Amino acid sequence: MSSVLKAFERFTIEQELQDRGEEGSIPPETLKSAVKVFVINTPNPTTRYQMLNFCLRIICSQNARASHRVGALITLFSLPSAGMQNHIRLADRSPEAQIERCEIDGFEPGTYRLIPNARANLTANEIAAYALLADDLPPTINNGTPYVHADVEGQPCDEIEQFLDRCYSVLIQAWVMVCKCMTAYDQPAGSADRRFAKYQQQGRLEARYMLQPEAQRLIQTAIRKSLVVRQYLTFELQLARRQGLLSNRYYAMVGDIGKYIENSGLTAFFLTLKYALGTKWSPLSLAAFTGELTKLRSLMMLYRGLGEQARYLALLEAPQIMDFAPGGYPLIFSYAMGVGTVLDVQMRNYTYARPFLNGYYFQIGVETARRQQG
Amino acid sequence: MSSVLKAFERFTIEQELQDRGEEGSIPPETLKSAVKVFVINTPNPTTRYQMLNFCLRIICSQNARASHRVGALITLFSLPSAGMQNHIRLADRSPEAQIERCEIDGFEPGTYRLIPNARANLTANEIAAYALLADDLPPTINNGTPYVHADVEGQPCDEIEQFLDRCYSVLIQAWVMVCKCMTAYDQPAGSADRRFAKYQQQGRLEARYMLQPEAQRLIQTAIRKSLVVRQYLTFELQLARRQGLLSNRYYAMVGDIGKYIENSGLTAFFLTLKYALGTKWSPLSLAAFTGELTKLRSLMMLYRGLGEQARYLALLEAPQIMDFAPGGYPLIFSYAMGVGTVLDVQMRNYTYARPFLNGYYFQIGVETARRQQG
RNA sequence: UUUUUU
RNA sequence: UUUUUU
RNA sequence: UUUUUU
């Protein structure tokens, strides 16, 4: 019959799209750890280099609380700001944060101790705790500094332009690790290898401030296992896609790597799109099977409806990412892999063997490709 | 099925075009090095020749700060201005700059020292620093001067018209190096060879003021690794495409070389356009594969939407350049190369062998071409 | 009534 | 749940 | 990421 099929499609579409909710939903007000973020009123470049080393060590430290690592990351990714108050008021949106502003006047010389402002609210004890924290690197980190070349922490900085080189090499390493932070981990990544090669050859990444592979993996894990940091990263990426061609050097790098971050972890979805709705002959083989096809169509409507942040799924780990799973269309997925295994050799390195991979439809993908070619 | 394919196309288009943001986006206010640019109130041609040699040496110097090289380049490319204040207020737009105007009254005779104005704010110490900086050429630069013929720095200039010849030969060499500054480097470039031959034979380039190959490579690198300079270059090119046929000699040369600068580094994109959407028979072979085709169509919409500056991608290194990468359509790219390898012998010198180059589709390009011909 | 998979 | 490439 | 030609 026919009208049954039409009602079937309309039902699929509605049941998928109904998970939209309201965009301005203020979720339940849960427990939120108090975070202390460091703000520097006037642009003291030596203070900022000190703070960058401070926070990189905090994050690299092992005996640090999660709120400590979060204050560290939110201060670190917010150092290039001119007026840092109104740039931390950007993370202020995030519901899972109750940050308090720490008005830093400087560092006690030669040591990691802090020098608070007058209006700021700080006691010496927490300062000493921070100090004893800021020097606790794991034993695998060689030479007691996160960088590969130990002298870098010792290099003095009083000119804004050198601090900018240092800060930006640091942050580009950070974002490059964020790229595969939720997906590929505990593994030396050829992908991050190549992204680092590219950003060196582009002169944005300076081997003068390269970080050791283990410190890279460490900051990757440390940013993954926090959330307010990733909400702030998404705030930043959505600012960096809002600027025109005229931009800072920072936001430019931000967007350049965001072009790699976006659409993270939805690989099976997009590969199915590519090797079934891209190759003009897939319904030529899978024409009977409209369930998966309307499934995918619903998924695309959902994607576009989700908003601009739809690309930051695996980053924000919002619930919706479960939808696009390849379980919702295993036959078309098996065919898409059976195609990609011959229309690409690079894809043969994908974890495409799934529990629900149809063997015969993968075989049909293979044979269709080999007939297209042979 | 069909409606799946239609939704697929619409989704591709939207996901590509949504990266537009807002044209007037004022990015995050990051750290910006203070730049001192030299302004000459009244048209003193001897002062301007002195300043041109001053800045060319500064840029060629090795022990100079980045803010120094930036002040140098922004003064150099802004010497032909009549009222230099309101021509530096053009670079004033750029967010990554906080330039301060240096009201120069002249040079102390026989030396590189500067003579400030009354209202200007300058101390002797920075003047001496500038002086000791302005004479620090690398050892590979022969004869202690950037030019090939040493006497040129010694040639006195009091008449505007000679200063103009010198200045403009300098600047045309600069722009010719800018042409392949982000793309092809650390290599003697036959392209810059031919552009220099052309601009000599056109009488715009004067072998009297030719610069040595190594000094060329040096200024190329020095302009690449700065950004505010490239934002100012783009300001200039967008002024030079706004004048009619009636123009100065300067802006005319500017635009003439901009016709080579524009659409920089997007070569794979345009070659795919040329050898797949140019040759009227490519869908004749690749008709099934509509994914890449709608991909390209989205790319073109994005290009046109980006604005007039869309041609200055690799120059401005704005984030968007990542989009047009040949990774987003490897099969059509392999076919386009398999075609261009027979419909052109010049293209055989392109770095077309990519990791994701399909061998069989390159082979199909080759065979289709050889059947068209044979 | 329920019962596989994600 | 994730996993190739840019 | 880039890479031929004008």
What is A133-201 written as a DSSP string? Answer: HTT---SSSGGGSSBSSTHHHHS---SHHHHHHHHHHHHHHHHHHHHTTTTS-SS--HHHHHHHHHHHH
Structure tokens at B65: 């700060």
Contact pairs from chain A to chain B, CB under 8 Å: 158
Distance in Å, residue A60 CA to nucleotide D1 C1': 27
CA dihedral for B334, B335, B336, B338, sign (positive or negative): positive
**Phi, psi torsion values for A192, nearest 5 degrees:** -65, -35
Cβ pair B292, B214 in contact under 8 A: no
Separation of alpha carbons A146 and A91, rounded Å: 26
Residue B367 near chain A (CB below 8 Å) = no
How remote is the C-alpha of A145 from its chain's centroid? 24
Contact B29 A81 (CB under 8 A): yes
Residue type, B255: G
Pairing status of strand A114-116 against strand A36-40: unpaired
Separation of alpha carbons A84 and B75, rounded Å: 32
Residues 200-259 in A contacting B (C-alpha not used; CB under 8 Å): 202-203, 236, 239-252, 254-256, 258-259
**Phi, psi torsion values for B180, nearest 5 degrees:** -120, 25
* Burial of A281 per CB tally in 10 Å (0-12, 13-18, 19+): middle
Structure tokens at B156: 């006195």
Q: DSSP secondary-structure letter at A116?
A: E
Cβ pair A276, A339 in contact under 8 A: yes
Separation of alpha carbons A196 and A192, rounded Å: 6
Show Cβ contacts of residue A83 under 8 Å, excluding neighbours closer than 6 positions: B29
Nearest alpha carbon to residue A49 among A170, A177, A215: A170
Show Cβ contacts of residue A189 under 8 Å, excluding neighbours closer than 6 positions: A180
Separation of alpha carbons A54 and A61, rounded Å: 10
The minimum CA-CA distance between B292 and chain A, rounded to whole Å, is 7
Q: CB-CB: which of B3, B4, B95 is closest to A248? A: B95
* Burial of B130 per CB tally in 10 Å (0-12, 13-18, 19+): buried
Helix axes A3-17, A290-306, angle to 10 degrees: 30
Three-state secondary structure call for residue B111 = coil
Deposited resolution, Å = 3.5
Cβ pair B143, B151 in contact under 8 A: no
The minimum CA-CA distance between A119 and chain B, rounded to whole Å, is 25
Quickly tell me which residue has 């403009």 as its tokens.
B168
Print the SS3 string covering A246-314: CCCHHHHHHHHHHHHHCCCCCHHHHHHHHHHHHECCCHHHHCCCHHHHHHHHHHHHHHHHHCHHHHHHH
Distance in Å, residue A13 CA to nucleotide C5 C1': 21
Show Cβ contacts of residue A371 under 8 Å, excluding neighbours closer than 6 positions: none
Show Cβ contacts of residue A89 under 8 Å, excluding neighbours closer than 6 positions: none
Nearest alpha carbon to residue B57 among B5, B133, B123: B133
Q: Cβ atoms within 10 A of the Cβ of B43, count?
A: 13
What residues in B contact A195, CB-CB < 8 Å? none
- Distances from the Cα of B104 to the Cα of A263, B61, B65, B277, angstroms: 53, 21, 21, 56
Q: What residues form DSSP beta bridges with B219?
A: none
Establish whether B112 is an annotated binding residue.
no
Separation of alpha carbons A208 and A261, rounded Å: 25
Cβ pair A346, B355 in contact under 8 A: yes
Q: Cβ atoms within 10 A of the Cβ of A67, count?
A: 16
Residues 302-361 of chain A with CB under 7 A from strand C are 322, 325-328, 355-356
Residue B8 near chain A (CB below 8 Å) = yes
- DSSP, residue by residue, B274-331: IIIIISTTSHHHHTTBHHHHHHHHHHHHHHHHH-GGGGGHHHHT-GGGGTT-GGG-HH
Quickly tell me which residue has 């908003």 as its tokens.
A307
How remote is the C-alpha of A302 from its chain's centroid? 22
CA dihedral for A22, A26, A29, A33, sign (positive or negative): positive
Quickly tell me which residue has 């490897």 as its tokens.
B330
Cβ pair B170, B52 in contact under 8 A: yes
The minimum CA-CA distance between B207 and chain A, rounded to whole Å, is 32
- Distances from the Cα of A133 to the Cα of A34, A140, A146, B13, B354, angstroms: 18, 17, 15, 50, 47
Nearest alpha carbon to residue B371 among B292, B271, B284, B273: B284
Quickly tell me which residue has 């026919």 as its tokens.
A2
Separation of alpha carbons A101 and A38, rounded Å: 6
Among chain B residues, the shortest Cα distance to A199 is held by B317
